[PDB]
Amino acid sequence: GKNIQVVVRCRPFNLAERKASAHSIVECDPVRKEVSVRTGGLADKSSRKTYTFDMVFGASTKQIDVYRSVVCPILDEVIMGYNCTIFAYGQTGTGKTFTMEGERSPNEEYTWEEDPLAGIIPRTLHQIFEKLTDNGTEFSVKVSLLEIYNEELFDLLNPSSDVSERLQMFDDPRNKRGVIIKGLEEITVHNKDEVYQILEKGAAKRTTAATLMNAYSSRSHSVFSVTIHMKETTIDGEELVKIGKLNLVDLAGSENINQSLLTLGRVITALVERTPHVPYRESKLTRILQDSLGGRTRTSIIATISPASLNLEETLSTLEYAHRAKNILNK
Ligand SMILES: Nc1ncnc2c1ncn2[C@@H]1O[C@H](COP(=O)(O)OP(=O)(O)O)[C@@H](O)[C@H]1O
Ligand SMILES: CCOC(=O)C1=C(C)NC(=S)N[C@H]1c1cccc(O)c1
Ligand SMILES: [Mg+2]
């Protein structure tokens, strides 16, 4: 029906890299949707590997650029009453969290609503209220933040429990491409002015998780879901009741223990090789997101890479992985 769309985003060099006068081994050509990597040698003469994707974003790409080109189109589909998922995949330190969540500009220069460093999640929540409050639509927004570490599930938005309490997952007797996560809390976001504090609470609880679990920020998978219940009444009088859900997934670092990460790779292989048996059941992540992998959910993957020569091997691994994913078909 529809191939999973894959986009690549290369981050810029940081301070420590700039001062060292580092030479980028990555060249991005958005118009041609290609990414080229210097696999050995220098700029005078050398070999390179090139890959074509659905979209390519170089180091000069700002958060708003990513939102306008990839997220906006997807959010519109969600608002039409469909389900969508966006994965962030890549080596630790390449920008998965920066892309999915973003961060705050230093010294309280901007409000969260205007911060140029804000990522996909905050921009999406803000825009949902902007677009639906604008037109004549009755709506409700609910969010949840589920995280997976060592194949255990945690609810990062429940203010009544601590990160030591794991959640139980069961098969949904009703629908077969889904599961039931007992205890997972869904928080109602009444208005745009309740967004930041809800996101902050999740961030604070995540800090306690990092203290209890080793390399939590690198080894955990985060699934932020936003569900929108709408009752739209056209200027003529017809009412259209629809429900849309968007899953924003920040995957564990791909650098080479993580059953969900290993299984995701195996699921993709089975899907692209057209193998009858797809191992969805082998991990919590793939059971939870089964409909996003060869299912009926519109899925996109943002593969993040580094431009530093020090990360050549992992950069190539990420590109090869992302290129293969382009052949997965959903409906
Ligand atoms: N596109 C980008 N533009 C500017 N800085 C970035 C970008 N991507 C990542 N960074 C910076 O690079 C570092 C890597 O961040 P992070 O998002 O945490 O990576 P990851 O989640 O993949 O481990 C951070 O200090 C972040 O601010
Ligand atoms: C305490 C600092 O928090 C953050 O930067 C963010 C949090 C909690 N949660 C998400 S999803 N993204 C970050 C965020 C939220 C709003 C505006 C921004 O520019 C960055
Ligand atoms: Mg991260």
Side-chain angles (χ1 to χ4, degrees):
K2 189 175 189 295
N3 284 295
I4 287 188
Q5 294 180 297
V6 181
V7 306
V8 173
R9 186 188 192 177
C10 183
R11 68 163 175 71
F13 285 103
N14 49 62
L15 269 291
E17 297 177 307
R18 175 189 175 183
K19 61 182 290 65
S21 186
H23 60 295
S24 172
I25 60 170
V26 174
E27 288 176 354
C28 296
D29 186 20
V31 73
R32 285 170 47 180
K33 302 176 177 179
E34 304 194 316
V35 295
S36 182
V37 184
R38 183 172 302 163
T39 55
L42 14 81
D44 205 51
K45 119 177 179 185
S46 58
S47 52
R48 297 187 83 90
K49 285 182 184 297
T50 64
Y51 308 75
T52 296
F53 294 90
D54 293 292
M55 290 196 90
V56 46
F57 291 108
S60 67
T61 308
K62 276 67 188 66
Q63 300 287 57
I64 190 170
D65 293 333
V66 173
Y67 190 88
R68 287 169 59 78
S69 295
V70 60
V71 185
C72 195
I74 294 173
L75 184 51
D76 288 320
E77 278 222 1
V78 174
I79 291 177
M80 283 180 253
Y82 288 105
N83 302 312
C84 295
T85 294
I86 302 178
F87 289 98
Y89 178 100
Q91 160 184 45
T92 291
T94 56
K96 294 186 303 298
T97 295
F98 182 80
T99 297
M100 299 298 109
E101 300 184 3
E103 49 190 59
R104 302 310 312 274
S105 292
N107 217 46
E108 297 194 307
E109 185 178 5
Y110 306 86
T111 60
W112 74 270
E113 305 179 57
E114 311 187 318
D115 201 316
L117 298 185
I120 296 179
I121 296 176
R123 288 178 186 279
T124 294
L125 260 17
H126 178 284
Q127 285 312 96
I128 287 177
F129 286 104
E130 196 81 357
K131 293 217 284 291
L132 283 54
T133 299
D134 174 289
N135 53 59
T137 300
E138 189 181 309
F139 69 98
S140 185
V141 179
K142 289 185 300 180
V143 302
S144 64
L145 181 54
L146 173 75
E147 306 209 342
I148 306 173
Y149 180 92
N150 189 47
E151 289 307 276
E152 291 195 307
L153 308 175
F154 305 87
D155 182 340
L156 279 295
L157 296 182
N158 183 174
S160 302
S161 63
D162 60 359
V163 298
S164 56
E165 181 75 301
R166 62 178 295 177
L167 299 173
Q168 302 168 66
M169 185 178 90
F170 310 79
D171 284 338
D172 195 321
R174 321 187 79 134
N175 26 324
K176 297 131 73 50
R177 262 186 108 63
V179 300
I180 292 299
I181 301 178
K182 178 182 179 63
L184 184 62
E185 277 197 354
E186 310 190 15
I187 303 183
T188 296
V189 184
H190 302 88
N191 53 70
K192 181 253 290 63
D193 294 309
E194 269 177 44
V195 172
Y196 197 56
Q197 59 189 316
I198 296 176
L199 297 180
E200 288 180 285
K201 193 60 60 64
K205 196 174 183 182
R206 188 172 283 163
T207 299
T208 63
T211 304
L212 298 188
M213 295 170 263
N214 300 175
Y216 186 87
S217 68
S218 296
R219 303 177 179 173
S220 64
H221 300 277
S222 182
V223 180
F224 189 101
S225 301
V226 60
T227 302
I228 311 170
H229 280 273
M230 307 162 279
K231 190 174 182 178
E232 178 176 298
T233 60
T234 310
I235 56 178
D236 305 311
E238 64 272 60
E239 63 178 63
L240 302 175
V241 178
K242 38 190 171 60
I243 302 81
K245 186 176 180 177
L246 172 63
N247 306 124
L248 301 172
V249 186
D250 184 336
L251 299 169
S254 60
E255 63 272 20
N256 197 62
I257 47 176
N258 201 128
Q259 184 62 29
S260 278
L261 197 59
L262 288 171
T263 302
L264 174 58
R266 290 159 186 161
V267 164
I268 292 170
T269 297
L271 291 169
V272 300
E273 302 194 311
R274 305 265 62 182
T275 305
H277 182 266
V278 184
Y280 297 117
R281 278 176 167 287
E282 302 190 18
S283 82
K284 304 304 175 55
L285 181 70
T286 52
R287 288 182 63 188
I288 293 169
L289 299 172
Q290 182 172 174
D291 199 52
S292 294
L293 303 167
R296 298 183 183 295
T297 296
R298 172 178 180 171
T299 301
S300 300
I301 296 173
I302 298 178
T304 57
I305 61 177
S306 159
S309 54
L310 281 171
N311 304 303
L312 174 61
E313 177 173 48
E314 290 298 353
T315 287
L316 288 180
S317 179
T318 291
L319 294 173
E320 292 290 333
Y321 183 102
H323 194 74
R324 285 164 53 68
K326 294 175 61 185
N327 305 74
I328 299 174
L329 290 63
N330 289 180
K331 305 134 302 175

Coordinates of all heavy atoms in Angstrom, one line a residue, residues 85-156:
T85 N 3.2 6.8 13.0 CA 4.3 6.6 13.9 C 5.6 7.2 13.3 O 5.8 7.1 12.1 CB 4.5 5.1 14.1 OG1 3.4 4.6 14.9 CG2 5.8 4.9 14.9
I86 N 6.4 7.8 14.1 CA 7.7 8.3 13.6 C 8.8 7.8 14.5 O 8.7 8.0 15.7 CB 7.7 9.9 13.6 CG1 6.6 10.5 12.8 CG2 9.1 10.4 13.1 CD1 6.6 12.0 12.8
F87 N 9.7 7.1 14.0 CA 10.8 6.5 14.7 C 12.1 7.4 14.5 O 12.3 8.0 13.5 CB 11.2 5.2 14.2 CG 10.3 4.1 14.5 CD1 9.3 3.7 13.6 CD2 10.3 3.4 15.8 CE1 8.5 2.6 13.8 CE2 9.4 2.3 16.0 CZ 8.5 1.9 15.0
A88 N 12.9 7.5 15.6 CA 14.2 8.2 15.5 C 15.2 7.0 15.7 O 15.1 6.4 16.8 CB 14.3 9.2 16.6
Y89 N 16.1 6.8 14.8 CA 17.0 5.7 14.9 C 18.5 6.2 14.6 O 18.7 7.0 13.7 CB 16.7 4.6 13.8 CG 17.7 3.5 13.8 CD1 17.4 2.3 14.4 CD2 18.9 3.6 13.1 CE1 18.2 1.2 14.4 CE2 19.8 2.5 13.1 CZ 19.5 1.3 13.8 OH 20.3 0.2 13.8
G90 N 19.4 5.7 15.4 CA 20.8 6.1 15.2 C 21.7 5.9 16.4 O 21.2 5.6 17.5
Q91 N 23.0 6.1 16.2 CA 24.0 6.0 17.3 C 23.8 7.0 18.3 O 23.3 8.1 18.1 CB 25.4 6.1 16.6 CG 26.5 6.4 17.5 CD 27.8 6.6 16.8 OE1 27.9 7.2 15.7 NE2 28.9 6.0 17.3
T92 N 24.1 6.7 19.6 CA 24.0 7.6 20.7 C 24.9 8.8 20.4 O 26.0 8.7 19.9 CB 24.5 7.0 22.0 OG1 23.6 6.0 22.4 CG2 24.6 8.0 23.1
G93 N 24.3 10.0 20.6 CA 25.0 11.3 20.3 C 24.9 11.9 18.9 O 25.6 12.8 18.5
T94 N 23.9 11.3 18.1 CA 23.7 11.8 16.8 C 22.5 12.8 16.6 O 22.3 13.4 15.6 CB 23.5 10.7 15.8 OG1 22.5 9.8 16.2 CG2 24.8 9.9 15.6
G95 N 21.7 12.8 17.7 CA 20.5 13.7 17.6 C 19.1 13.1 17.7 O 18.1 13.8 17.3
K96 N 19.0 11.9 18.1 CA 17.6 11.3 18.2 C 16.8 12.1 19.2 O 15.7 12.5 18.8 CB 17.7 9.8 18.7 CG 18.4 8.9 17.8 CD 18.3 7.4 18.3 CE 19.0 7.3 19.7 NZ 20.4 7.6 19.7
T97 N 17.2 12.4 20.4 CA 16.5 13.1 21.4 C 16.3 14.6 21.0 O 15.2 15.2 21.1 CB 17.1 13.0 22.8 OG1 17.0 11.7 23.2 CG2 16.4 13.9 23.8
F98 N 17.4 15.2 20.4 CA 17.3 16.5 19.9 C 16.2 16.7 18.9 O 15.4 17.7 18.9 CB 18.6 16.9 19.3 CG 18.7 18.4 18.8 CD1 18.9 19.4 19.8 CD2 18.4 18.7 17.5 CE1 18.9 20.7 19.4 CE2 18.4 20.0 17.1 CZ 18.6 21.1 18.1
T99 N 16.1 15.7 18.0 CA 15.1 15.7 17.0 C 13.7 15.5 17.5 O 12.7 16.2 17.2 CB 15.4 14.7 15.8 OG1 16.6 15.0 15.2 CG2 14.3 14.7 14.8
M100 N 13.5 14.4 18.3 CA 12.2 14.1 18.8 C 11.7 15.0 19.9 O 10.5 15.3 20.0 CB 12.2 12.7 19.4 CG 12.5 11.6 18.3 SD 11.3 11.5 16.9 CE 12.2 12.2 15.6
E101 N 12.6 15.5 20.8 CA 12.2 16.3 21.9 C 12.7 17.8 21.8 O 12.0 18.7 22.1 CB 12.7 15.7 23.2 CG 12.2 14.4 23.6 CD 12.7 13.9 24.9 OE1 13.3 14.7 25.6 OE2 12.3 12.7 25.3
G102 N 13.9 17.9 21.4 CA 14.5 19.2 21.3 C 15.1 19.6 22.7 O 15.1 18.7 23.6
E103 N 15.5 20.8 22.8 CA 16.0 21.3 24.1 C 15.7 22.7 24.3 O 15.0 23.3 23.4 CB 17.5 21.0 24.2 CG 18.3 21.5 23.1 CD 19.8 21.0 23.1 OE1 20.0 19.7 23.1 OE2 20.7 21.8 23.1
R104 N 16.1 23.3 25.4 CA 15.8 24.8 25.6 C 17.0 25.6 25.2 O 18.2 25.2 25.5 CB 15.5 25.0 27.1 CG 14.3 24.3 27.7 CD 13.1 24.4 26.8 NE 12.8 25.8 26.4 CZ 12.1 26.6 27.1 NH1 11.6 26.3 28.2 NH2 11.9 27.9 26.6
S105 N 16.8 26.8 24.6 CA 17.8 27.7 24.3 C 18.3 28.2 25.6 O 17.5 28.4 26.5 CB 17.3 28.9 23.4 OG 16.9 28.4 22.2
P106 N 19.7 28.4 25.8 CA 20.2 28.9 27.0 C 19.7 30.2 27.6 O 19.2 31.0 26.8 CB 21.7 28.9 26.7 CG 21.9 27.9 25.6 CD 20.7 28.2 24.8
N107 N 19.9 30.4 28.9 CA 19.5 31.6 29.6 C 18.1 32.1 29.5 O 17.9 33.3 29.5 CB 20.5 32.7 29.1 CG 20.9 33.7 30.2 OD1 21.3 33.2 31.3 ND2 20.9 35.0 29.9
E108 N 17.1 31.2 29.4 CA 15.7 31.6 29.3 C 15.4 32.7 28.3 O 14.7 33.6 28.5 CB 15.2 32.1 30.7 CG 15.3 31.1 31.8 CD 14.4 31.6 33.0 OE1 14.7 32.7 33.5 OE2 13.6 30.8 33.5
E109 N 16.0 32.5 27.1 CA 15.8 33.5 26.0 C 14.4 33.5 25.4 O 13.9 34.5 25.0 CB 16.9 33.3 24.9 CG 16.8 34.4 23.8 CD 17.8 34.3 22.8 OE1 18.6 33.3 22.8 OE2 17.9 35.1 21.9
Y110 N 13.8 32.3 25.3 CA 12.5 32.1 24.7 C 11.5 31.4 25.6 O 11.9 30.6 26.5 CB 12.5 31.4 23.4 CG 13.5 31.9 22.4 CD1 14.8 31.5 22.4 CD2 13.0 32.8 21.4 CE1 15.7 32.0 21.4 CE2 13.9 33.3 20.4 CZ 15.2 32.9 20.4 OH 16.1 33.3 19.4
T111 N 10.2 31.5 25.4 CA 9.2 30.8 26.1 C 9.2 29.4 25.3 O 9.8 29.4 24.2 CB 7.8 31.4 25.9 OG1 7.5 31.4 24.5 CG2 7.8 32.8 26.4
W112 N 8.7 28.4 25.9 CA 8.8 27.1 25.3 C 8.1 27.1 23.9 O 8.5 26.3 23.0 CB 8.2 26.0 26.2 CG 6.7 26.0 26.3 CD1 5.9 26.7 27.2 CD2 5.7 25.3 25.4 NE1 4.6 26.5 27.0 CE2 4.4 25.6 25.9 CE3 5.9 24.5 24.3 CZ2 3.3 25.1 25.3 CZ3 4.7 24.0 23.7 CH2 3.5 24.3 24.2
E113 N 7.0 27.9 23.7 CA 6.3 28.0 22.5 C 7.0 28.6 21.3 O 6.7 28.4 20.2 CB 5.0 28.8 22.7 CG 4.1 28.3 23.8 CD 2.9 29.2 24.0 OE1 2.1 29.4 23.0 OE2 2.7 29.8 25.1
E114 N 8.1 29.4 21.6 CA 8.8 30.0 20.5 C 10.3 29.6 20.4 O 11.0 30.1 19.6 CB 8.8 31.6 20.7 CG 7.4 32.1 20.9 CD 7.4 33.6 20.9 OE1 8.3 34.2 21.5 OE2 6.4 34.2 20.3
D115 N 10.7 28.7 21.3 CA 12.1 28.2 21.3 C 12.5 27.5 20.0 O 11.9 26.5 19.7 CB 12.3 27.3 22.5 CG 13.7 27.2 22.9 OD1 14.6 27.1 22.0 OD2 14.0 27.2 24.1
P116 N 13.4 28.1 19.3 CA 13.8 27.5 18.0 C 14.5 26.1 18.2 O 14.6 25.3 17.2 CB 14.8 28.5 17.5 CG 15.4 29.1 18.7 CD 14.2 29.3 19.6
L117 N 14.8 25.7 19.4 CA 15.4 24.4 19.7 C 14.4 23.3 20.0 O 14.7 22.1 20.2 CB 16.5 24.4 20.7 CG 17.7 25.3 20.4 CD1 18.8 25.1 21.6 CD2 18.3 24.9 19.1
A118 N 13.1 23.7 20.2 CA 12.0 22.8 20.5 C 12.0 21.7 19.4 O 12.1 22.0 18.2 CB 10.7 23.5 20.6
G119 N 11.7 20.4 19.8 CA 11.7 19.4 18.8 C 10.3 19.0 18.4 O 9.3 19.7 18.5
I120 N 10.1 17.8 17.8 CA 8.9 17.3 17.3 C 7.7 17.2 18.3 O 6.6 17.6 18.0 CB 9.1 15.9 16.6 CG1 10.0 16.1 15.4 CG2 7.7 15.3 16.2 CD1 10.3 14.8 14.6
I121 N 7.9 16.6 19.5 CA 6.9 16.5 20.4 C 6.2 17.8 20.9 O 5.0 17.9 20.8 CB 7.4 15.7 21.7 CG1 7.8 14.3 21.3 CG2 6.3 15.7 22.8 CD1 8.4 13.5 22.5
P122 N 7.0 18.7 21.4 CA 6.4 20.0 21.8 C 5.8 20.8 20.7 O 4.7 21.4 20.8 CB 7.6 20.8 22.4 CG 8.8 20.2 21.7 CD 8.5 18.7 21.6
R123 N 6.4 20.8 19.5 CA 5.8 21.5 18.3 C 4.5 20.9 17.9 O 3.6 21.6 17.6 CB 6.8 21.5 17.2 CG 8.0 22.4 17.3 CD 9.0 22.3 16.2 NE 10.2 23.0 16.4 CZ 10.3 24.4 16.3 NH1 9.3 25.1 15.8 NH2 11.5 24.9 16.6
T124 N 4.4 19.5 18.0 CA 3.2 18.8 17.6 C 2.1 19.1 18.5 O 1.0 19.4 18.1 CB 3.5 17.3 17.6 OG1 4.4 17.0 16.5 CG2 2.2 16.5 17.4
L125 N 2.4 19.1 19.8 CA 1.3 19.4 20.8 C 0.8 20.8 20.7 O -0.4 21.0 20.7 CB 1.9 19.2 22.2 CG 1.6 17.8 23.0 CD1 1.1 16.7 22.1 CD2 2.8 17.4 23.7
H126 N 1.7 21.7 20.5 CA 1.4 23.1 20.3 C 0.5 23.3 19.1 O -0.5 24.0 19.1 CB 2.6 24.0 20.3 CG 2.3 25.5 20.1 ND1 1.9 26.0 18.8 CD2 2.4 26.5 20.9 CE1 1.8 27.3 19.0 NE2 2.0 27.6 20.2
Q127 N 0.9 22.7 18.0 CA 0.1 22.8 16.7 C -1.2 22.2 16.8 O -2.2 22.6 16.1 CB 1.0 22.3 15.6 CG 2.1 23.3 15.2 CD 1.6 24.7 15.0 OE1 1.7 25.5 16.0 NE2 1.0 25.0 13.9
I128 N -1.4 21.1 17.5 CA -2.7 20.4 17.6 C -3.7 21.4 18.1 O -4.8 21.5 17.5 CB -2.6 19.2 18.6 CG1 -1.8 18.1 17.9 CG2 -4.0 18.7 18.9 CD1 -1.6 16.8 18.9
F129 N -3.4 22.1 19.2 CA -4.3 23.1 19.8 C -4.5 24.3 18.9 O -5.5 24.9 18.9 CB -3.7 23.5 21.1 CG -3.9 22.5 22.2 CD1 -2.8 21.8 22.7 CD2 -5.2 22.3 22.8 CE1 -3.0 20.8 23.6 CE2 -5.4 21.3 23.7 CZ -4.3 20.5 24.2
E130 N -3.4 24.7 18.1 CA -3.5 25.8 17.2 C -4.4 25.5 16.1 O -5.3 26.4 15.7 CB -2.1 26.1 16.7 CG -1.9 27.5 16.1 CD -1.7 28.6 17.1 OE1 -1.8 28.3 18.3 OE2 -1.5 29.8 16.7
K131 N -4.3 24.4 15.5 CA -5.1 24.0 14.3 C -6.6 23.6 14.6 O -7.5 23.9 13.8 CB -4.5 22.9 13.5 CG -3.2 23.3 12.8 CD -3.0 22.6 11.5 CE -2.6 21.2 11.6 NZ -1.2 21.0 12.1
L132 N -6.8 23.0 15.7 CA -8.2 22.6 16.1 C -9.0 23.6 16.8 O -10.2 23.6 16.7 CB -8.1 21.3 16.9 CG -7.9 20.0 16.1 CD1 -6.6 20.1 15.3 CD2 -7.8 18.8 17.1
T133 N -8.3 24.5 17.5 CA -9.0 25.6 18.2 C -9.4 26.6 17.2 O -10.5 27.3 17.3 CB -8.1 26.3 19.3 OG1 -7.7 25.3 20.3 CG2 -8.9 27.4 20.0
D134 N -8.6 26.7 16.1 CA -8.8 27.6 15.0 C -10.2 27.4 14.4 O -11.1 28.2 14.4 CB -7.7 27.5 14.0 CG -7.9 28.4 12.8 OD1 -8.8 28.0 12.0 OD2 -7.2 29.4 12.6
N135 N -10.3 26.2 13.7 CA -11.5 25.8 13.1 C -12.6 25.5 14.1 O -12.4 25.6 15.3 CB -11.3 24.7 12.1 CG -10.6 23.5 12.7 OD1 -11.1 22.9 13.7 ND2 -9.4 23.1 12.2
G136 N -13.7 25.0 13.6 CA -14.8 24.6 14.5 C -14.8 23.1 14.8 O -15.6 22.3 14.3
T137 N -13.9 22.7 15.7 CA -13.8 21.3 16.1 C -13.8 21.1 17.6 O -13.0 21.8 18.4 CB -12.4 20.7 15.6 OG1 -12.5 20.8 14.1 CG2 -12.3 19.3 16.0
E138 N -14.6 20.2 18.1 CA -14.7 19.9 19.5 C -13.6 18.8 19.6 O -13.6 17.8 18.8 CB -16.1 19.3 19.8 CG -16.4 19.1 21.3 CD -17.8 18.5 21.5 OE1 -18.7 19.1 20.9 OE2 -17.9 17.5 22.2
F139 N -12.7 18.9 20.6 CA -11.7 17.9 20.7 C -11.1 17.7 22.0 O -11.1 18.5 22.9 CB -10.5 18.2 19.7 CG -9.7 19.4 20.1 CD1 -8.5 19.3 20.7 CD2 -10.2 20.7 19.8 CE1 -7.8 20.4 21.1 CE2 -9.5 21.8 20.1 CZ -8.3 21.7 20.8
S140 N -10.5 16.5 22.2 CA -9.8 16.1 23.5 C -8.4 15.5 23.1 O -8.3 14.8 22.1 CB -10.7 15.1 24.2 OG -10.1 14.8 25.5
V141 N -7.4 15.9 23.9 CA -6.1 15.3 23.7 C -5.6 14.6 24.9 O -5.7 15.1 26.0 CB -5.1 16.5 23.4 CG1 -3.7 15.9 23.2 CG2 -5.5 17.3 22.2
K142 N -5.1 13.4 24.7 CA -4.5 12.5 25.7 C -3.1 12.1 25.4 O -2.8 11.8 24.2 CB -5.4 11.3 26.0 CG -6.7 11.6 26.6 CD -7.5 10.3 26.9 CE -7.8 9.5 25.6 NZ -8.5 8.2 26.0
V143 N -2.2 12.1 26.3 CA -0.8 11.7 26.1 C -0.3 10.7 27.1 O -0.8 10.6 28.2 CB 0.2 12.9 26.1 CG1 -0.3 14.0 25.1 CG2 0.2 13.5 27.5
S144 N 0.6 9.9 26.6 CA 1.2 8.8 27.5 C 2.7 8.7 27.1 O 3.0 9.0 25.9 CB 0.5 7.5 27.3 OG 0.7 7.0 25.9
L145 N 3.5 8.3 28.0 CA 4.9 8.2 27.8 C 5.3 6.9 28.4 O 5.4 6.7 29.6 CB 5.7 9.3 28.4 CG 7.2 9.3 28.2 CD1 7.6 9.2 26.7 CD2 7.9 10.5 28.8
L146 N 5.5 5.9 27.5 CA 5.9 4.5 27.9 C 7.4 4.3 27.6 O 7.8 4.7 26.5 CB 5.0 3.5 27.2 CG 5.3 2.0 27.3 CD1 4.9 1.6 28.7 CD2 4.6 1.3 26.2
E147 N 8.1 3.8 28.5 CA 9.5 3.5 28.2 C 9.9 2.1 28.4 O 9.4 1.4 29.3 CB 10.4 4.5 29.0 CG 10.0 5.9 28.7 CD 11.0 7.0 28.8 OE1 12.1 6.7 29.4 OE2 10.8 8.1 28.3
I148 N 10.8 1.5 27.6 CA 11.3 0.2 27.7 C 12.7 0.1 28.0 O 13.6 0.6 27.3 CB 11.0 -0.6 26.4 CG1 9.5 -0.5 26.0 CG2 11.4 -2.1 26.6 CD1 9.2 -1.0 24.6
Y149 N 13.1 -0.6 29.1 CA 14.5 -0.8 29.5 C 14.6 -2.2 30.0 O 13.9 -2.7 30.9 CB 14.8 0.2 30.7 CG 16.3 0.0 31.1 CD1 17.3 0.8 30.6 CD2 16.6 -0.9 32.1 CE1 18.6 0.6 30.9 CE2 18.0 -1.1 32.5 CZ 18.9 -0.3 31.9 OH 20.3 -0.5 32.3
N150 N 15.6 -2.9 29.3 CA 15.8 -4.3 29.7 C 14.5 -5.1 29.6 O 14.3 -6.0 30.5 CB 16.4 -4.4 31.1 CG 16.9 -5.8 31.4 OD1 17.6 -6.4 30.6 ND2 16.6 -6.3 32.6
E151 N 13.7 -4.9 28.6 CA 12.4 -5.5 28.4 C 11.4 -5.4 29.5 O 10.5 -6.2 29.7 CB 12.7 -7.0 28.1 CG 13.3 -7.3 26.7 CD 12.5 -6.6 25.6 OE1 11.5 -7.2 25.1 OE2 12.9 -5.5 25.2
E152 N 11.5 -4.3 30.3 CA 10.6 -4.0 31.3 C 9.9 -2.7 30.9 O 10.5 -1.8 30.2 CB 11.3 -3.8 32.7 CG 11.9 -5.0 33.3 CD 12.3 -4.9 34.7 OE1 13.0 -3.9 35.1 OE2 11.8 -5.7 35.5
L153 N 8.7 -2.5 31.3 CA 7.9 -1.3 30.9 C 7.7 -0.3 32.0 O 7.4 -0.7 33.1 CB 6.6 -1.7 30.3 CG 6.5 -2.7 29.2 CD1 5.1 -3.1 28.9 CD2 7.3 -2.2 28.0
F154 N 7.9 1.0 31.7 CA 7.7 2.0 32.7 C 6.8 3.2 32.2 O 6.9 3.5 31.0 CB 9.1 2.6 33.2 CG 10.0 1.5 33.6 CD1 10.9 0.8 32.7 CD2 10.1 1.1 35.0 CE1 11.7 -0.2 33.2 CE2 11.0 0.1 35.4 CZ 11.8 -0.5 34.5
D155 N 6.1 3.7 33.1 CA 5.2 4.8 32.8 C 5.8 6.1 33.4 O 5.9 6.2 34.6 CB 3.8 4.6 33.5 CG 2.8 5.7 33.2 OD1 3.2 6.8 32.8 OD2 1.6 5.5 33.4
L156 N 6.3 7.0 32.5 CA 6.9 8.2 32.9 C 6.0 9.4 33.2 O 6.5 10.5 33.5 CB 8.0 8.6 31.9 CG 9.4 7.8 32.0 CD1 10.0 8.2 33.4 CD2 9.1 6.3 32.0

